[PDB]
Amino acid sequence: QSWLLRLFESKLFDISMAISYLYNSKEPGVQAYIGNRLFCFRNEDVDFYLPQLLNMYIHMDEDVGDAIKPYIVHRCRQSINFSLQCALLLGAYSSHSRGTKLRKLILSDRLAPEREFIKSLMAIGKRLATLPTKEQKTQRLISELSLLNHKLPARVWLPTAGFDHHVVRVPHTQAVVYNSKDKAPYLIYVEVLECENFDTTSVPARIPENPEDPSAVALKEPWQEKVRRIREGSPYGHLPNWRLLSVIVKCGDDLRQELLAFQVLKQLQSIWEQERVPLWIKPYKILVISADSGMIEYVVNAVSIHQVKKQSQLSLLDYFLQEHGSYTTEAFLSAQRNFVQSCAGYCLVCYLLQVKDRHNGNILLDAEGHIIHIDFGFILSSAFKLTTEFVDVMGGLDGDMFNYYKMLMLQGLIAARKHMDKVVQIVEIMQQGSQLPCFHGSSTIRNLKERFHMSMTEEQLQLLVEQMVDGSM
Amino acid sequence: YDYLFKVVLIGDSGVGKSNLLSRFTRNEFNLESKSTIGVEFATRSIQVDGKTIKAQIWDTALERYRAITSAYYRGAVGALLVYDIAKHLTYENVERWLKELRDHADSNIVIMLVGNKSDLRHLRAVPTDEARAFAEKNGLSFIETSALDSTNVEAAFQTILTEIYRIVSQK
Numbered sequence: 001q002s003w004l005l006r007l008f009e010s011k012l013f014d015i016s017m018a019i020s021y022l023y024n025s026k027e028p029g030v031q032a033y034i035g036n037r038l039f040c041f042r043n044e045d046v047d048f049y050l051p052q053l054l055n056m057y058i059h060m061d062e063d064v065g066d067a068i069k070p071y072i073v074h075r076c077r078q079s080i081n082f083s084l085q086c087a088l089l090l091g092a093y094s095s096h097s098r099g100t101k102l103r104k105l106i107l108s109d110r111l112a113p114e115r116e117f118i119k120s121l122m123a124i125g126k127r128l129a130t131l132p133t134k135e136q137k138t139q140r141l142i143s144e145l146s147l148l149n150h151k152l153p154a155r156v157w158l159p160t161a162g163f164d165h166h167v168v169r170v171p172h173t174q175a176v177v178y179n180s181k182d183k184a185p186y187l188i189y190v191e192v193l194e195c196e197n198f199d200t201t202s203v204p205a206r207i208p209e210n211p212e213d214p215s216a217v218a219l220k221e222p223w224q225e226k227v228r229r230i231r232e233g234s235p236y237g238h239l240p241n242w243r244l245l246s247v248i249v250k251c252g253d254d255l256r257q258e259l260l261a262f263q264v265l266k267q268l269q270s271i272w273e274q275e276r277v278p279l280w281i282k283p284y285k286i287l288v289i290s291a292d293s294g295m296i297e298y299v300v301n302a303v304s305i306h307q308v309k310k311q312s313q314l315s316l317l318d319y320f321l322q323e324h325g326s327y328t329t330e331a332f333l334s335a336q337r338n339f340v341q342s343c344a345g346y347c348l349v350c351y352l353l354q355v356k357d358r359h360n361g362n363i364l365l366d367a368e369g370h371i372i373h374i375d376f377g378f379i380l381s382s383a384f385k386l387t388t389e390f391v392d393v394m395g396g397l398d399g400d401m402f403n404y405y406k407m408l409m410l411q412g413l414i415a416a417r418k419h420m421d422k423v424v425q426i427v428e429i430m431q432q433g434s435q436l437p438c439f440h441g442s443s444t445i446r447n448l449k450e451r452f453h454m455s456m457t458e459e460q461l462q463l464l465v466e467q468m469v470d471g472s473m
Numbered sequence: 474y475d476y477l478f479k480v481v482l483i484g485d486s487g488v489g490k491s492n493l494l495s496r497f498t499r500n501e502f503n504l505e506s507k508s509t510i511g512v513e514f515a516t517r518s519i520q521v522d523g524k525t526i527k528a529q530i531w532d533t534a535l536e537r538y539r540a541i542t543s544a545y546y547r548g549a550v551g552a553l554l555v556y557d558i559a560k561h562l563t564y565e566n567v568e569r570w571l572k573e574l575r576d577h578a579d580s581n582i583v584i585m586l587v588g589n590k591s592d593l594r595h596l597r598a599v600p601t602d603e604a605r606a607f608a609e610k611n612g613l614s615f616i617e618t619s620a621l622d623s624t625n626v627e628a629a630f631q632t633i634l635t636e637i638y639r640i641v642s643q644k
């Protein structure tokens with residue numbers, strides 16, 4: 001139609017709209033036209049939709065796939081990181097089919113050092129399965145990671161870091177195994193060197209070391225103090241681009257449903273910023289290694305509320321007063337504002353995504369006062385509760401900050417309605433050809449759209465927010 | 474009109490036959506497209522050497538409508554074999570389209586190998602030089618057009634109609 005070409009020509013045509021028509025249009029000429037406009041969007045804008053594109057190349061008809069293939073091949077040549085995350089996502093979502101063949105080609109045509117490093121970190125986690133205690137696992141984790149330094153520096157990077165870099169040293173001592181489970185996750189710290197563009201800068205120079213435990217001491221300390229001991233005892237800590245990263249390696253849990261939640265989190269974060277609503281959420285990057293392994297971006301200066309309640313032996317309100325300050329100091333009033341804004345943010349994230357399995361082991365607390373929800377495993381298809389302890393930090397029911405917590409949820413829901421399509425398509429595309437527990441009964445997307453309550457007036461949204469808060473109690 | 478030319482359009486389904494035939498007669502391009510059933514007819518007049526020529530252009534869909542598409546090849550003074558630039562299969566079957574045209578058209582018919590969809594710069598699968606070399610080796614006219622961008626669309630018909638007029642000069 002003349003109008004469609006006009007809309008595509010019209011600036012209103014953004015990268016989100018190109019995805020929707022590519023997923024919905026049955027006209028190949030329209031699919032092929034959009035497959036050529038991908039080259040004209042920004043590099044960063046299209047990458048956010050890479051799980052949607054590669055899932056469309058694998059599970060849609062050959063017309064949709066062969067319209068996406070030229071942009072993927074072009075991007076795989078520009079960025080080796082793009083090549084890596086492509087092959088990882090290709091083999092993750094196809095149980096066979098065309099994607100295996102594409103993945104083999106990407107692997108065949110400098111990726112071997114990176115693939116060897118990732119294959120090692122997953123081999124370490126699997127080997128720790130025979131050791132029953134969490135301290136016996138940590139004893140082998142640290143000595144095995146001390147062997148990766150024999151292969152460093154190298155053409156090896158961590159995709160969960162927003163910048164291009166090379167891994168130069170790993171401090172084995174600071175790594176910790178989380179629990180005594182067979183598929184137990186573990187945390188690792190990695191020293192990297194940032195560059196302007198990874199595919200142009202050569203491997204950094206190697207600097208040896210010589211122990212005596214001056215920096216090996218692994219103790220519970222602030223992140224600012226954990227870096228100081230590491231940078232001091234490191235041979236690369238004197239460099240300007242020296243940066244310390246933190247990654248959680250889960251070698252036996254599937255993180256694809258955690259990647260879907262990362263996108264929905266980052267889109268809502270984009271929607272509220274656009275609508276100038278001061279909500280707050282924390283999206284942590286997910287590196288899907290395979291259909292049952294991956295990595296988690298470790299947020300620093302953040303600890304489970306279950307651990308804050310155990311370590312401090314206090315209540316939540318008592319901890320903020322001790323950690324931040326009195327009712328009349330600026331330090332507490334700031335941490336309370338960050339608590340309220342982050343709560344109202346994650347309240348909507350929970351309601352819209354139906355995030356079940358909500359206890360204080362899956363809720364964090366950063367140093368500024370925000371909260372962070374993790375383990376998006378029971379979503380769509382235990383529910384979120386604003387417990388008696390949470391209402392206290394906001395000054396009680398009749399207080400001002402609780403009414404502000406109420407209005408923040410309303411403003412953020414009005415905002416999410418103005419951009420419902422950008423969020424639903426993230427979930428709707430991934431339902432294609434997936435066997436994840438979130439998609440079941442074919443009502444997953446019908447009920448997801450129904451929860452936005454597009455038909456309701458703003459007056460009826462107010463009463464809807466009142467009811468939701470009462471249930472959360 | 475001084476002359477009444479009869480031109481046909483051949484090519485694999487989905488290469489821009491209907492939109493090239495559209496964009497020439499009237500400046501209309503549609504992405505949402507219906508496949509041509511049987512044949513499509515559009516007309517336009519041109520002036521070559523000051524003689525007003527009328528062109529009956531038919532978008533022949535040929536084995537599917539063999540009884541009808543063959544009746545439009547008979548007496549056809551010209552033909553435009555168009556292929557998709559962003560689809561290498563439609564370029565491999567060009568020889569097959571030339572074979573069916575030669576079987577049912579006159580030897581004097583001038584055939585122009587057109588490479589549609591030149592706006593799809595990045596998805597290009599057929600090189601420009603391989604088509605221009607394939608034209609000289611087979612005695613055709615190579616020229617890549619864009620019915621969407623409306624570039625070379627009016628200049629491709631006027632380089633085969635002027636050729637259809639210059640070859641009728643031997644009278």
Ligand SMILES: CNC(=O)c1ccc(-c2cnn3ccc(C(=O)N(C)c4ccc(Cl)c(C(=O)OC)c4)cc23)cc1
Pocket residue numbers: 176177178185186187248253255258284296297298299300302303304307361364374375376377
């Ligand atoms: C399916 N997905 C997950 O299970 C997932 C998602 C995000 C996280 C996560 C990201 N940053 N971050 C910062 C702090 C903490 C944190 O305080 N605790 C106490 C914590 C809780 C649970 C685990 Cl399993 C671990 C762990 O492996 O530590 C080595 C640590 C957790 C996280 C962990 C697991």
Ligand SMILES: Nc1nc2c(ncn2[C@@H]2O[C@H](COP(=O)(O)OP(=O)(O)O)[C@@H](O)[C@H]2O)c(=O)[nH]1
Pocket residue numbers: 027028029030033484485486487488489490491492493503504505506507508509589590591592593618619620621622
């Ligand atoms: N990008 C581009 N697309 C085109 C061009 N010509 C046609 N199309 C599209 O490709 C499809 C071809 O449809 P149509 O012309 O009816 O196919 P045909 O008549 O059998 O060759 C339609 O969706 C058109 O919108 C062109 O020059 N450039």
